[PDB]
């Protein structure tokens, strides 16, 4: 399948080269997979979600996304126009308040929630969790992400936006999950992207158009925007039967575009997520 005039990041993940604008993907499109977006919530009535999004948990007085950040990330995973996996099922877990903030204890509870809640959902092709959040190093946060991965969920986490080594941030620094850096449309490391040996992969993260609250759209930047590209890619590849939740990060790294990015510090992988379609 081909989507013309796609957001640059979608075109990038199906291309061997930067500078094109059509997204190419197998029409299965992640059908039968599920992706949990652990964030500020999802405005599930957005027409772009087509009834495939739903809230499954909040830790706050409402499940509404009063921020936009979770809606944007969910759109990059799975919206019809802005999403990588256009037929996946999206599940919102609101661990962040409408200012985008959350306590680590709530974030941990949300990760353990997903590890159990997937047993209440129909995801025959597999389960992914996208965590566009993080803060300073916490062994408890890293352990929660490790448990979620161990339970059979492909966990993709943002590297962080500090232009620093991700080893000092969580859950970015957890070795067993997929830690995602950000790139721009010219195949440069995004200026804010964290780096370091703990990164597994880069995805598009500068100037990413997606869904927003109030039935709208906007373009924003962050490793938060790169992470859902990789989460959606994992769901897509699991639907195709190419990989599994336990192996998808490694598979994505093995099949990535190699050596295409600039300003990658010595010791950080030079790997850009690629669907090889």
Curated annotation (Swiss-Prot):
Keyword vocabulary terms for this entry: Calcium, Disulfide bond, Hydrolase, Metal-binding, Protease, Serine protease, Signal, Zymogen
GO biological processes: proteolysis
The UniProt record lists the keyword Signal: yes
Segments forming domain Peptidase S8: 7-277
Annotated binding of Ca(2+) 2, by residue: 16, 260
Cofactor(s) listed in the protein's UniProt record: Ca(2+)
Segments forming a coiled coil: none
Catalyzed chemical reaction(s): Hydrolysis of keratin, and of other proteins with subtilisin-like specificity. Hydrolyzes peptide amides
Enzyme category, top tier: hydrolase
GO CC terms in record: extracellular region
Binding residues annotated for Ca(2+) 1, in chain numbering: 175, 177, 200
Active site: 39, 69, 224
Enzyme Commission number, as recorded: 3.4.21.64
Keyword DNA repair (UniProt): no
One function term, GO molecular function aspect: metal ion binding
Disulphides: 34-123, 178-249
Cofactor: how and how many bound: Binds 2 calcium ions per subunit.
Family designation: Belongs to the peptidase S8 family.
Function, as annotated: Hydrolyzes keratin at aromatic and hydrophobic residues.
Protein name, as recorded: Proteinase K
High-level lineage: Eukaryota, Fungi, Dikarya, Ascomycota, Pezizomycotina
Name of the gene this protein is made from: PROK
Coverage span on the entire protein: 106 to 382 of 384
